[PDB]
Paper text:
Meiosis protein [name] is an essential component of the synaptonemal complex (SC), which mediates homologous chromosome synapsis.
The increased solubility of [name] ΔCtip and FFV mutants at high concentrations enabled their crystallisation and structure solution by X-ray crystallography. The interfaces between symmetry-related and unique chains are distinct, and on the basis of subsequent data, were designated as dimer and tetramer interfaces, respectively. The four-helical bundles are stabilised by heptad interactions between chains in the dimer and tetramer interfaces, which also contribute to hydrophobic cores. Further, the ΔCtip SAXS scattering curve was closely fitted by the ΔCtip tetrameric crystal structure upon addition of the few missing C-terminal amino-acids (χ2 = 1.54), confirming that the ΔCtip crystal structure is representative of its tetrameric structure in solution. Thus, we conclude that [name] ΔCtip forms the anti-parallel tetramer observed in its crystal structure, albeit prone to concentration-dependent dissociation, and the same tetrameric structure is stabilised within [name] FFV by Ctip coiled-coils ‘tying-off’ both ends of the molecule. [name] ΔCtip and LFIL dimers form tetramers through the same interfaces, but lack stabilising Ctip coiled-coils, owing to their deletion (ΔCtip) and disruption (LFIL).
Residue numbers in the entry:
A (entry chain A), D (entry chain A): 50 to 109
B (entry chain B), C (entry chain B): 47 to 111
Write the structure that this text describes.
C-alpha cells in the first residue's frame, strides 16, 4: 500500500507540474499573439497610408 | 467607369475587409484567453480537490493503524 | 454512510468532472485550430489580392509613361 | 512615386513574412497542445487506476 500511495503521490506531483507549465505556456502565447496583432496592425496601416496617398495623387 | 477606377474601388473594399478580419481575430483571441484561464484554473482546482481527499484518507487510515 | 464512503464518492465525482473537462478542452482546441487555419488563409489571401491589384496598376501606369 | 512604390512593396514583403511566420507558429502550437493533452490524459489515467485499485481494496 505504501508503494502504491507513493506512486499515486508521484503522479499527482507530475500532474501539478504539467498543469502549471501549460498555464504559463498559455500566458506566454497570449503575449506573443498581442505582439503579432500590433505589428500587423502597424504594417497594414503603413501600407494603407501609402496606398491612400498614391490613389489620391492619381485621382487628383 | 474605367478599369482603374473599378480596381481602386476593389482595393478599398479589400482593405476594409482586412481591417475587419484583423479586429475580429484580435477580439476572438481575447475571448479565448479568458476561457483558457478559466479552464486551466478549474481543472487545476479539481486535481487539488481529489489530491486533498486522498491525503485525508491516507492520513486517517494511518491513525487507524 | 460513513465519512470515508462519502469522501470516496466525492472522489469519484471529481474524477468524472476532470475527465469531462479534459475532453471538452481537447475538443475546444480542435475547433480553434480549424478556425485559426481559416482566418490565417483568408487574411493572407486578401493581402495578396490587394498586392496583386497594386502590381497591376503599377505595371499599367508604366506602359502609360 | 518610385520611392513610395518601393516602400509599399517593402511593407507588403514584411506583411507576407509576418503572416506565414504566425501561420507556422499556430501550426506548432497545435502540435504542442496535442502532446500536452496526451500526457495529461495518460497521467490522469495512471492516477485514476491507482485510486480505483486502492478504493476497491478498502471496500473489499
Amino acid at each position: 500500500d505504501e508503494a502504491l500511495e507513493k506512486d499515486l503521490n508521484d503522479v499527482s506531483k507530475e500532474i501539478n507540474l504539467m498543469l502549471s507549465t501549460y498555464a504559463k505556456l498559455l500566458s506566454e502565447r497570449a503575449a506573443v499573439d498581442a505582439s503579432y496583432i500590433d505589428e500587423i496592425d502597424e504594417l497594414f496601416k503603413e501600407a494603407n497610408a501609402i496606398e491612400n496617398f498614391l490613389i489620391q495623387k492619381r485621382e487628383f
